[PDB]
Amino acid sequence: VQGAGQLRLSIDAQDRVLLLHIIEGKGLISKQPGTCDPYVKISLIPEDSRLRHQKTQTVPDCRDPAFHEHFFFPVQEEDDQKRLLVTVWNRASQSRQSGLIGCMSFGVKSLLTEISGWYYLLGEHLGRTKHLKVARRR
Amino acid sequence: QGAGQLRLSIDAQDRVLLLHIIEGKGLISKQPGTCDPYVKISLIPEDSRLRHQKTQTVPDCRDPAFHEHFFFPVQEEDDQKRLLVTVWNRASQSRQSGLIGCMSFGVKSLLTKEISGWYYLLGEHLGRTKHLKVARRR
């Protein structure tokens, strides 16, 4: 699964404080059998800690979820070489069973020097290395 | 790139992984300062750290001797995940700890494969996709 769907988001930086707006998702593809109950988790990588992780609500049984949630992710100089990871998960009753639908990432330093629109959900490996916007072709 | 080598052993016993993290060699940390490594074991992808396990942190040593045994129980639902072995360079605050290198092993394959000896520490992206043993060359 190369393209697991699309996510609409916005990212703006304000004095070393990342403002993320996770709007909605579309055409989500989950290889797990059953309902699609997605949520979005934001974090930085690589980082051996989850204290900074943040997530949206879980939208039950929907392949085109409307999140409409804003996040404030503060970053510091020491985070410049990390990447902001945005991951869509398919919730399971027990966390360890939750499957990864797709992900994408943005370099932290590059975000401090604006993102907005639809982006593709990439694979568990590829998504940690880049992001790909959905062309507007306007 | 190669961030050093790690000597380990992995054996499966009735859906219970027995890992033996022996020692590391030639560790390369791009962070300025002492090299204070520790090894963290986990499964990916997985939105939870409850199953994560780590070794002691060996202060100021590029060829650390861990000599630690781990028991990582896995279940049928974990077959499609990968066992990730990551070497971290400890910082006073976790978020500042840098990743030295990593490698991974498919869970299903581990239940079949003879993991015992020296392996290369791969990059933060490549290491989540495979492992590479250090050839004995007879």
Coordinates of N, CA, C and O in Angstrom, one line a residue, chain A residues 39 41 45-50 52-53 74 76 78-79 82-83 89 91 94-98 100 124-125 128-129, chain B residues 38 40 44-49 51-52 73 75 77-78 81-82 88 90 93-97 99 124-125 128-129:
Chain A
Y39 N -7.5 8.1 13.8 CA -7.1 9.3 14.7 C -5.7 9.6 14.2 O -5.1 8.8 13.5
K41 N -1.9 11.2 15.0 CA -0.9 11.4 16.1 C 0.2 12.2 15.6 O 0.8 11.9 14.5
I45 N 10.6 13.0 15.4 CA 11.4 11.8 15.3 C 12.8 12.3 14.8 O 12.9 13.2 14.0
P46 N 13.9 11.6 15.2 CA 13.8 10.5 16.2 C 13.8 11.1 17.6 O 14.4 12.2 17.9
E47 N 13.1 10.5 18.5 CA 13.0 10.9 19.9 C 12.5 9.8 20.8 O 11.5 9.2 20.6
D48 N 13.3 9.5 21.8 CA 13.0 8.4 22.7 C 12.1 8.9 23.9 O 12.6 9.0 25.0
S49 N 10.9 9.4 23.6 CA 10.0 9.9 24.6 C 8.6 10.2 23.9 O 8.6 10.6 22.7
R50 N 7.6 10.0 24.6 CA 6.2 10.2 24.1 C 5.5 11.4 24.8 O 4.4 11.8 24.5
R52 N 5.8 14.4 24.4 CA 5.4 15.5 23.5 C 4.4 15.1 22.4 O 3.9 15.9 21.7
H53 N 4.0 13.8 22.4 CA 3.1 13.3 21.5 C 1.7 13.9 21.7 O 1.3 14.1 22.8
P74 N 5.3 23.0 20.7 CA 6.5 23.9 20.9 C 7.8 23.1 20.6 O 7.9 21.9 20.9
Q76 N 12.3 23.5 20.1 CA 13.4 24.3 20.5 C 14.6 24.1 19.5 O 14.5 23.2 18.7
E78 N 17.3 22.6 19.7 CA 17.8 21.2 19.7 C 16.9 20.3 18.9 O 17.3 19.1 18.7
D79 N 15.7 20.8 18.4 CA 14.8 20.0 17.6 C 14.9 20.2 16.1 O 14.3 19.5 15.3
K82 N 15.3 17.3 13.8 CA 14.3 16.2 13.8 C 13.2 16.5 12.8 O 13.2 17.5 12.1
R83 N 12.3 15.6 12.6 CA 11.2 15.7 11.7 C 9.9 15.6 12.4 O 9.7 14.9 13.4
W89 N -3.7 6.5 12.5 CA -3.8 5.2 13.1 C -5.2 4.7 13.0 O -6.2 5.5 13.1
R91 N -7.7 2.8 15.2 CA -7.8 2.4 16.6 C -8.4 1.0 16.9 O -9.3 0.5 16.2
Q94 N -7.3 -2.5 22.1 CA -6.1 -2.5 22.9 C -5.1 -1.8 21.9 O -4.9 -2.2 20.8
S95 N -4.4 -0.7 22.4 CA -3.4 0.0 21.6 C -2.5 -0.8 20.8 O -2.3 -0.4 19.6
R96 N -1.9 -1.8 21.3 CA -0.9 -2.6 20.6 C -1.5 -3.2 19.3 O -0.8 -3.6 18.4
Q97 N -2.9 -3.3 19.2 CA -3.5 -3.8 18.0 C -3.9 -2.8 17.0 O -4.3 -3.1 15.9
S98 N -3.7 -1.5 17.4 CA -4.0 -0.4 16.4 C -3.0 -0.5 15.2 O -1.8 -0.5 15.4
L100 N -1.3 1.0 11.6 CA -0.9 2.2 11.0 C -1.5 2.3 9.6 O -1.3 1.4 8.8
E124 N 4.6 3.3 6.2 CA 5.3 3.3 7.5 C 6.8 3.7 7.5 O 7.4 4.1 8.5
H125 N 7.5 3.4 6.3 CA 8.9 3.7 6.2 C 9.0 5.0 5.4 O 9.6 6.0 5.9
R128 N 8.3 8.6 7.0 CA 9.2 9.1 8.0 C 10.3 9.9 7.3 O 11.1 10.5 8.0
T129 N 10.4 9.9 6.0 CA 11.4 10.6 5.2 C 11.0 11.8 4.4 O 11.9 12.6 4.0
Chain B
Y38 N 22.8 3.2 25.2 CA 21.9 2.2 25.8 C 21.1 1.7 24.6 O 21.1 2.3 23.5
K40 N 17.5 0.1 23.1 CA 16.1 0.0 23.4 C 15.5 -1.0 22.4 O 15.7 -0.9 21.2
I44 N 7.5 -2.5 15.9 CA 7.0 -1.4 15.1 C 6.2 -2.0 13.9 O 6.6 -3.1 13.4
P45 N 5.1 -1.4 13.4 CA 4.6 -0.1 14.0 C 3.7 -0.5 15.2 O 3.0 -1.5 15.2
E46 N 3.7 0.4 16.2 CA 2.9 0.2 17.4 C 2.8 1.5 18.2 O 3.8 2.0 18.6
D47 N 1.6 1.9 18.4 CA 1.3 3.1 19.1 C 1.2 2.9 20.6 O 0.2 3.0 21.2
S48 N 2.4 2.5 21.2 CA 2.4 2.2 22.7 C 3.9 1.9 23.0 O 4.6 1.3 22.3
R49 N 4.2 2.3 24.3 CA 5.6 2.0 24.7 C 5.6 1.0 25.9 O 6.7 0.7 26.4
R51 N 5.5 -2.0 25.9 CA 6.3 -3.2 25.7 C 7.8 -2.9 25.5 O 8.6 -3.8 25.4
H52 N 8.1 -1.6 25.4 CA 9.5 -1.2 25.3 C 10.4 -1.7 26.4 O 10.0 -1.7 27.6
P73 N 7.7 -11.1 25.0 CA 6.6 -11.9 24.5 C 5.9 -11.3 23.4 O 5.6 -10.1 23.3
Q75 N 2.6 -12.1 20.3 CA 1.4 -12.9 20.0 C 1.1 -12.9 18.5 O 1.8 -12.2 17.7
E77 N -1.0 -11.6 16.7 CA -1.3 -10.3 16.1 C 0.0 -9.4 15.9 O -0.1 -8.4 15.3
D78 N 1.1 -9.9 16.3 CA 2.4 -9.2 16.2 C 3.2 -9.7 15.0 O 4.2 -9.1 14.7
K81 N 4.6 -7.3 12.5 CA 5.4 -6.2 13.0 C 6.9 -6.6 12.9 O 7.3 -7.7 12.5
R82 N 7.8 -5.6 13.2 CA 9.2 -5.9 13.1 C 9.8 -5.6 14.5 O 9.3 -4.6 15.2
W88 N 20.8 4.3 21.5 CA 20.6 5.7 21.7 C 21.8 6.3 22.5 O 22.4 5.6 23.3
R90 N 22.4 8.7 25.3 CA 21.7 9.4 26.4 C 22.0 10.8 26.7 O 23.2 11.2 26.7
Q93 N 18.1 15.1 29.4 CA 16.7 15.1 29.2 C 16.5 14.2 28.0 O 17.1 14.4 27.0
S94 N 15.6 13.2 28.2 CA 15.3 12.3 27.1 C 15.1 12.8 25.7 O 15.7 12.3 24.7
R95 N 14.4 13.9 25.5 CA 14.2 14.5 24.2 C 15.5 14.9 23.5 O 15.5 15.1 22.3
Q96 N 16.5 15.1 24.3 CA 17.8 15.4 23.7 C 18.7 14.2 23.3 O 19.7 14.4 22.7
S97 N 18.2 13.0 23.7 CA 19.0 11.8 23.4 C 19.0 11.6 21.9 O 18.0 11.6 21.3
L99 N 19.8 9.4 18.3 CA 19.8 8.1 17.8 C 21.2 7.8 17.1 O 21.6 8.5 16.3
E124 N 18.5 5.7 10.8 CA 17.2 5.9 11.4 C 16.0 5.4 10.5 O 15.0 5.1 11.0
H125 N 16.2 5.4 9.2 CA 15.2 5.0 8.3 C 15.5 3.6 7.8 O 14.6 2.7 8.0
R128 N 14.9 0.4 10.2 CA 13.5 0.0 10.5 C 13.0 -1.0 9.4 O 11.9 -1.5 9.5
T129 N 13.8 -1.2 8.4 CA 13.4 -2.1 7.3 C 14.1 -3.4 7.1 O 13.7 -4.3 6.5

